[PDB]
Amino acid sequence: GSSGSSGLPIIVKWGGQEYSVTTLSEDDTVLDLKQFLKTLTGVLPERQKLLGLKVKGKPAENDVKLGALKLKPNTKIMMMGTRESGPSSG
Numbered sequence: 001g002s003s004g005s006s007g008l009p010i011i012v013k014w015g016g017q018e019y020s021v022t023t024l025s026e027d028d029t030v031l032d033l034k035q036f037l038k039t040l041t042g043v044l045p046e047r048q049k050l051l052g053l054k055v056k057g058k059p060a061e062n063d064v065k066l067g068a069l070k071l072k073p074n075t076k077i078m079m080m081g082t083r084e085s086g087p088s089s090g
Contacts, residue, residue: 008066011076012050014041018076026067030060043083052077 010021010033019040024032034045041048050059053071060069082089 005073009074011074012037012040013076013078017041019079024066026065028066029062030064030066031062033066034062037079041079041081041083043081047081049080050077051080 007022008025010024012019012021019037021033021036021040024036031045034048037043037048038045045062052075053059053069055061055064055069060066
């Protein structure tokens with residue numbers, strides 16, 4: 001290509017869409033990601049469900065370091081949840 005590595009790229013899969021994240025790094029916390037995932041997709045973080053990286057049952061927390069998890073790069077993970085308040089969208 002042209003460039004190699006630098007930070008920690010992340011990939012998310014929402015329904016039928018893929019989101020890329022290359023702003024935050026290991027330093028940043030899951031929250032940062034979530035917070036950024038709240039604007040990327042448009043769903044609350046507490047609601048946003050991260051499917052891919054689990055932790056002895058439940059997935060990492062927002063008060064947990066993404067680095068500690070030592071996940072893989074360009075790790076295409078999945079997401080679950082809904083946008084807008086209420087069960088019915090429209």
